[PDB]
Design a protein around this nucleic acid. Structure first.
Ligand SMILES: [Zn+2]
Ligand SMILES: [Zn+2]
Ligand SMILES: [Zn+2]
Lengths: 49, 64, 48, 214, 511, 102, 48
RNA sequence: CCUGGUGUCUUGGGUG
DNA sequence: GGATTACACCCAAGACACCAGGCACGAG
DNA sequence: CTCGTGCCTGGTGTCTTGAATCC
C-alpha cells in the first residue's frame, strides 16, 4: 500500500478506511506513556497490575 | 595590490611548520618570505605567474 | 520509446511535489478553504 | 641511581613517526640496518636510536639531533606513511616512553587457551625456572564415554568423580589423587601446568556463576 | 613480460657483499582442463561433469621462473593458478572429438559455446563499449564557464592496450569576457593548469618564431594568430628551458623541498613519460611530442574559429568494443601484480633466515584462481575489497530460455553510462549505427538505447601489429618529421598510424 | 629471537648457543653451556624493541643502561629473572645484576 | 589519537555520510548502515 | 494436548 | 559545495583474511 | 622416546597507489 494509494483514499475522503488499513490490518501495537514526561518509559507488568 | 598569504611550508631554520608568510609584490616584481616564529626574512624576484611555492623553492636553493 | 521511458519519471516527480504541497487543504464548515494551520487560502471554495 | 640518568636539553631530540599497524618492529629493524651500513661513510645516518612500544600501536620513536635525519632514516621505507607526519616529543615526556611496566600462589587467574579458556583457576604453584604455573581447575570431562577436544565442543564443568571413572573407564596416586587419562585430579580438581603467558592475572571479574561456586 | 624481473639488494655489512636476489619469469605453458579429486587422482574434465557437480571448467597454468644470484664484495614449472576456458575455443576438450563422440559426452552439437562455466553456472561476458584512445576530440562548454572549447585525449599504449593517463587543453575566455584569451593545458600529476607556451619551451623549443611555426601552417590567417597573441605575452618572462622545467616541477603533486637541482629532473620524467605516452617513451625523441602538441592547438583553434564543427561523441568510428580477450587481459594484469607483491613481501622474510626457498611455497595459486572466479561469478570488475567504484554487470548468467535468446545474449554490447544522466545522446539510434548494430533490438525501460546488439554480418577486429604498416609507408615515399617545414610543405597531407603523427607525404593519391 | 637477561640484547637464540652473549659472555659463558643454561639466562619473552646505533651518546641507551654495550637490538622489558645460582656466581665476579623485568 | 577515534566511532554510528572524509567500512568492504541512513530514502523508515 | 521459526544486503535480467 | 532525478511487481545469483599457536604425526 | 615440522583452528584487525544539470 504505497504513497500513491494513500493519496487516493484522501481524495475519496475515506478517512476511516485509511486508518484501519494502516493499523488493524497491519502492524498495530500498544504502548504505554507517562502522563508527565510523555516518554515511552513505562514499565508495565500486566499480571501484577 | 600586494598579496599577503599564509602557507603550510616549514621554515628552513627554526623548523616551525605552517609559520611562513609570503608577500608577493607584483608591481615591483619582489617576493618576500617571512617567518611568523623566529622572524627571519628572505627576498627573491618573482614574475607574474609565481605563487608561494615558487619563492619557497628559490629559498631552498639559496641555502644549499 | 526513449521519450516515453524518460519523461514518465519527469512527470512522476511533478505529481509527487504537487500532492505534498496540497494534501492538507480542506473545505471547512464556514465555506472557507484552509490548510492545517487554519490559514485561509480562499474565502470561498472555487469562488462559487 | 636511575634519577641521575634523566634527560636534559643537551640530549638528542626524539620524534615520533606514524607507521603501518603491526610493522613497528620491522621499521625499528630497518632503521638499525641502515644505521650500521652507513657507519663511517661520508653520509652516516645521524640517528642514535629508534624504538617501538607495544602499548603505542602504529608509532616508532627516533632519537636524533636534526629533523632531516628522521626523514633520512625513513626514506624509502614501505611501512611508513608518506604524509609528513612526524611529531616532536618533549624532554619531560622521554622517560615515560621507556617505562618497562603479578601472580601469587593461592590467587585466582583466568585461563586464556584450550578447553579451559575463560575458566577461573587457582594458582597452585610455579615452575622453578619461572614460566608455567600449576593451576587448580574444575574439570570438563566425559569419562571416555565416546572414545574409539576443542573449546567450542568441550564438556560442562564438574568436579572429577573417581568412582564414576572407576565404573566407566584410572590410577590412584595418593590420598584423593588420581591420574585419569594422563591428567592429575586431586580432591576433584584438575592440576595442570599452563604457561604464565596463557593466563590472565589482571582485572578479572568473577561471574555470577563463580560467586555461587567459589 | 610487462614487468619481467623482480630485484632485491642488500649492501652486506654485518666485508660488503651486494647480494642481488633476482627472479625472471619465462615461457608460459598450458594444459588441458583437469579435475583433481580430493583423492589426488586426475582426469580430463569435460563440461557435462562440470555443470552437474558445480565445478569450474578451467585449465592449470604453469610458468617458468628462473633464479639468479649476483654476489659482489664492494627454477622450473611453478603453478600459478587456473584460468577458466571458453567452451569450443581451441583450449577446450570439445574442440576435437568429432560429431560421433560429442553425443557420448552429452554435448549438443547445436551448442556453439562462447561462454564459461563457473560453479556450475554458465557465465557470458558482455562486450563493453568505450571511447577510442589516442584520438583528439573537441567539445564546446556551457555558458557559466570561463572555458568555451576543450580538447581532450586519453592516452593508452599499443602493447597490452591499457589506459595510462588523460590530458586536456582548455581555451579560457568567454564571448567578450575573460580579457586575455589565453590557453592553458592540464598535465597528469600536476595540480594547476600551465600555459601552452611554457610547455613548448619546456620541451626544448624556446623562440616564439619556431613555436608558431609548429602550430599554425598558414601565415596569412591573422584571426588565428590574433588568438595566440595573449598566450605569447602571458608566457614571455619564461625565456629559457631551465626556468620553464622548474615552473612545472613546483606544481606537480610532489613533496616540498626537492630543490631546482633535482625538481627539474623530476619534471623531465613527467614530460618524457605520462605526457602523451602513446607516441614514444625513449629518450632523445622530443621532436615528436613538440610537433604533436602544435597539431592539438591547431585543431583547438579551428573549432573556436567556427571553421569546423565540434566532434560528435556518438560517431561510431570513435568507439571501440572490449570483448572477452581485452577484458581478461586488464583483469589478469591487476591480479598478476597482486601475486607479484606477495612474492616480494615473502622473500624479505624468507631470506633473513638464509634458507633456500622451495619456490612452490612462494606462489599461492589462490590469488589468481579466486580472483578470476569471483569477478566472473559476480560481475564486479576489480579487487574484491573494492567492489564499489568498480564496474558491475560485465558477466551475466547466460539466458537459456529459448534458442534465439542464447544467440542474442552472446552478441550483446553494453555502454556503461548509467541511469544517472537523462538527455538523449547516448540513447539515440545514431546514423553511423547502420549495418553495425541492430536498429530494432533494444530493451524496454532503463537500459533502453544503451544496450545494443550486433547486426548479423558484424565482426570485431582482433588486432594487428602496426610495425609492418610503418615499413610499407616508408618504402613508398613517406618522409620523416625532421624534414618538414610549413613554408616548404604548405600543401602536403599528414599521415597518422593509430593516432600518432608519423610522417608526411606530398602525393597521397598514388599512395 | 631471545633477549639476554643481563644486558637486554636481542639475538637469534642459536647465537646465544654459538657465540654466547656479545656483551656478557665473559661472565655468563653461554657459548660453552647447554640449552638449559642459555634458556635460564635469555628469554623468549620481551617487549619494546630498541635499535641502538650509538650506545655511548644515546640518551635512550643511557636510560636503559646499555650505553657501554655494542650497537644492536635491545629490549626495554625482558621477562623472567636470572636464576639465583647464576646471580650468586655473577656476584662472585664483581658483577651486579639489575633485573630488566620491571 | 585515541580520543579523536572515539569521536569518530560515535559520529559514524549516527551518520556515516559525513562530507569530506572516508566512510566507516565493514570488513566485507561495504559501508556501515548508520542510523541516519536508516531513515532516509525510498526504503527507509519514513518513506518505506 | 493446546502453541508452532527459516535470513539478509546487493547486483543483474524482466513485466505494465 | 550536495540534492534531485515514476510506480509497482517477478525471479535467479552470491557471502573475511592473515597470522600465530598448539597439537599431532613422522622420522631419526 | 623426543624433537621438529606441518596443518588446522581461533582470534584479532587493513592499505601498493588508482554524470549531469540546477539553486
Ligand atoms: Zn515520566
Ligand atoms: Zn623561521
Ligand atoms: Zn647479555
Amino acid at each position: 500500500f504505497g504513497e500513491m494509494e494513500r493519496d487516493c483514499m484522501i481524495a475519496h475522503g475515506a478517512a476511516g478506511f485509511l486508518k484501519e488499513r494502516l493499523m488493524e490490518a497491519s502492524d498495530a501495537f500498544r504502548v504505554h506513556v507517562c502522563g508527565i514526561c510523555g516518554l515511552m518509559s513505562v514499565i508495565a507488568n500486566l499480571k501484577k497490575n | 595590490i600586494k598579496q599577503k598569504l599564509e602557507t603550510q611550508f616549514t621554515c628552513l631554520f627554526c623548523n616551525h611548520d605552517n609559520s611562513v608568510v609570503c608577500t608577493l609584490d607584483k608591481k615591483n616584481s619582489i617576493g618576500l618570505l617571512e617567518c611568523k616564529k623566529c622572524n627571519l626574512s628572505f627576498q627573491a624576484p618573482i614574475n607574474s605567474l609565481s605563487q608561494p611555492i615558487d619563492i619557497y623553492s628559490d629559498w631552498i636553493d639559496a641555502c644549499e | 520509446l526513449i521519450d516515453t521511458a524518460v519523461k514518465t519519471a519527469e512527470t512522476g516527480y511533478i505529481q509527487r511535489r504537487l500532492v505534498k504541497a496540497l494534501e492538507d487543504i480542506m473545505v471547512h464548515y464556514d465555506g472557507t478553504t484552509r490548510n492545517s494551520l487554519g490559514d485561509i487560502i480562499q474565502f470561498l471554495y472555487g469562488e462559487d | 641511581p636511575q634519577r641521575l640518568l634523566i634527560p636534559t636539553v643537551d640530549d638528542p631530540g626524539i620524534w615520533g613517526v606514524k607507521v603501518r599497524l603491526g610493522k613497528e618492529k620491522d621499521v625499528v629493524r630497518q632503521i638499525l640496518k641502515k644505521k650500521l651500513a652507513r657507519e663511517g661513510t661520508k653520509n652516516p645516518l645521524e640517528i642514535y636510536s629508534a624504538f617501538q612500544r607495544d602499548s603505542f600501536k602504529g608509532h616508532v620513536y627516533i632519537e636524533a639531533r636534526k629533523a632531516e635525519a628522521i626523514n633520512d632514516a625513513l626514506k624509502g621505507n614501505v611501512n611508513v606513511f608518506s604524509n609528513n607526519s612526524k611529531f616532536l616529543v618533549g624532554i619531560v615526556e622521554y622517560k615515560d616512553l621507556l617505562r618497562p611496566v603479578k601472580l601469587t600462589r593461592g590467587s585466582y587467574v583466568r585461563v586464556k587457551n584450550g578447553k579451559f579458556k575463560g575458566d577461573l583457576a587457582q594458582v597452585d604453584e610455579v615452575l622453578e625456572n619461572g614460566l608455567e604455573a600449576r593451576l587448580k581447575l574444575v574439570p570438563r570431562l566425559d569419562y571416555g564415554k565416546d572414545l574409539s577436544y576443542t573449546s567450542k565442543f568441550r564438556p560442562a564443568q564438574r568436579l572429577f568423580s573417581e568412582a564414576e571413572a572407576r565404573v566407566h573407564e584410572i590410577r590412584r596416586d595418593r590420598d584423593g589423587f588420581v591420574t585419569y587419562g594422563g591428567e592429575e585430579y586431586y580432591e576433584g580438581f584438575l592440576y595442570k601446568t599452563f604457561r604464565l603467558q596463557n593466563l590472565i592475572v589482571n582485572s578479572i571479574n568473577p561471574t555470577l556463576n563463580e560467586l555461587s561456586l567459589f | 613480460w610487462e614487468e619481467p624481473r623482480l630485484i632485491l639488494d642488500q649492501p652486506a655489512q654485518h666485508d660488503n657483499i651486494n647480494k642481488r636476489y633476482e627472479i625472471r619469469f619465462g615461457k608460459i605453458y598450458l594444459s588441458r582442463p583437469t579435475m583433481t579429486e580430493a583423492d589426488g587422482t586426475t582426469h580430463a574434465m569435460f563440461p557435462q561433469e562440470a555443470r552437474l557437480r558445480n565445478l569450474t571448467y578451467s585449465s592449470p597454468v604453469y610458468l617458468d621462473m628462473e633464479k639468479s644470484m649476483f654476489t659482489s664484495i664492494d627454477g622450473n614449472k611453478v603453478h600459478i593458478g587456473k584460468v577458466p576456458i571458453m567452451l569450443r575455443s581451441k583450449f577446450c576438450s570439445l574442440r576435437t572429438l568429432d560429431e560421433v563422440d560429442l553425443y557420448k559426452m552429452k554435448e549438443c552439437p547445436y551448442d556453439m559455446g562462447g561462454y564459461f562455466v563457473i560453479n556450475g553456472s554458465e557465465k557470458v561476458l558482455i562486450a563493453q563499449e568505450r571511447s577510442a584512445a589516442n584520438i583528439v576530440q573537441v567539445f564546446k562548454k556551457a555558458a557559466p564557464s570561463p572555458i568555451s572549447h576543450v580538447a581532450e585525449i586519453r592516452s593508452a599504449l599499443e602493447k597490452g592496450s591499457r589506459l595510462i593517463s588523460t590530458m586536456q587543453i582548455k581555451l579560457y575566455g568567454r564571448e567578450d569576457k575573460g580579457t586575455g584569451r589565453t590557453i592553458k593545458a592540464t598535465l597528469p600529476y600536476v595540480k594547476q593548469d600551465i600555459p601552452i607556451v611554457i610547455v613548448f619551451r619546456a620541451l626544448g623549443v624556446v623562440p616564439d618564431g619556431e613555436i608558431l611555426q609548429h602550430i599554425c601552417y598558414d601565415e596569412n590567417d591573422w584571426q588565428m594568430l590574433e588568438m595566440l597573441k595573449p598566450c605569447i605575452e602571458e608566457g614571455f618572462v619564461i625565456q629559457d628551458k631551465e626556468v620553464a622545467l622548474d615552473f612545472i616541477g613546483r606544481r606537480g603533486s610532489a613533496a616540498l623541498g626537492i630543490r631546482r637541482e633535482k625538481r627539474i629532473q623530476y619534471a623531465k620524467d613527467i614530460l618524457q613519460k605520462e605526457l602523451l605516452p602513446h607516441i614514444t617513451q625513449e629518450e632523445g625523441f622530443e621532436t615528436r611530442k613538440t610537433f604533436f602538441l602544435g597539431y592539438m592547438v591547431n585543431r583547438l583553434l579551428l573549432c573556436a574559429l567556427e571553421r569546423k564543427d565540434q566532434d560528435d561523441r556518438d560517431h561510431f568510428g570513435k568507439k571501440r568494443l572490449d570483448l572477452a580477450g581485452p577484458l581478461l587481459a586488464n583483469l589478469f594484469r591487476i591480479l598478476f601484480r597482486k601475486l607479484t607483491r606477495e612474492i616480494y613481501r615473502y622473500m624479505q622474510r624468507c631470506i633473513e633466515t638464509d634458507r633456500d626457498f622451495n619456490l612452490n611455497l612462494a606462489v599461492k595459486s589462490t590469488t589468481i584462481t579466486s580472483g578470476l572466479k569471483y569477478s566472473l561469478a559476480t560481475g564486479n570488475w576489480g579487487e574484491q575489497k573494492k567492489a564499489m567504484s568498480s564496474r558491475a554487470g560485465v558477466s551475466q548468467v547466460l539466458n537459456r530460455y529459448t534458442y534465439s535468446s542464447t544467440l542474442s545474449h552472446l552478441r550483446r554490447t553494453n555502454t556503461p553510462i548509467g541511469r544517472d544522466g537523462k538527455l538523449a545522446k547516448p540513447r539515440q539510434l545514431h546514423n553511423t549505427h547502420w549495418g553495425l548494430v541492430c536498429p530494432a533490438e533494444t530493451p524496454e525501460g532503463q537500459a533502453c538505447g544503451l544496450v545494443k546488439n550486433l547486426s548479423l554480418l558484424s565482426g570485431i577486429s582482433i588486432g594487428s601489429p602496426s610495425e609492418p604498416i610503418i615499413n610499407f609507408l616508408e618504402e613508398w615515399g613517406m618522409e620523416p618529421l625532421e624534414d618538414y617545414d610549413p613554408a616548404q610543405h604548405t600543401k602536403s597531407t599528414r599521415i597518422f598510424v593509430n593516432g600518432v603523427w608519423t610522417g608526411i607525404h606530398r602525393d597521397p593519391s598514388m599512395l | 629471537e631471545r633477549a639476554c637477561m643481563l644486558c637486554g640484547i636481542v639475538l637469534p637464540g642459536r647465537v646465544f648457543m654459538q657465540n654466547g652473549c656479545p656483551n656478557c659472555d665473559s661472565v655468563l659463558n653461554l657459548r660453552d653451556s647447554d640449552q638449559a643454561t642459555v634458556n635460564e639466562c635469555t628469554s623468549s619473552s620481551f617487549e619494546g624493541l630498541v635499535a641502538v646505533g650509538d650506545n655511548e651518546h644515546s640518551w635512550v641507551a643511557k636510560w636503559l643502561r646499555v650505553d657501554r654495550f655494542q650497537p644492536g637490538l635491545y629490549a626495554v622489558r625482558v621477562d623472567g629473572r636470572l636464576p639465583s645460582d647464576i646471580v650468586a656466581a655473577l656476584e662472585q665476579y664483581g658483577v651486579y645484576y639489575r633485573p630488566r623485568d620491571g | 589519537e585515541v580520543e579523536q577515534l572515539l569521536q569518530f566511532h560515535v559520529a559514524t554510528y549516527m551518520d556515516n555520510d559525513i562530507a569530506g572524509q572516508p566512510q566507516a567500512l565493514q570488513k566485507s568492504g561495504r559501508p556501515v548502515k548508520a542510523i541516519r541512513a536508516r531513515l532516509k530514502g525510498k526504503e527507509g523508515r519514513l518513506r518505506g
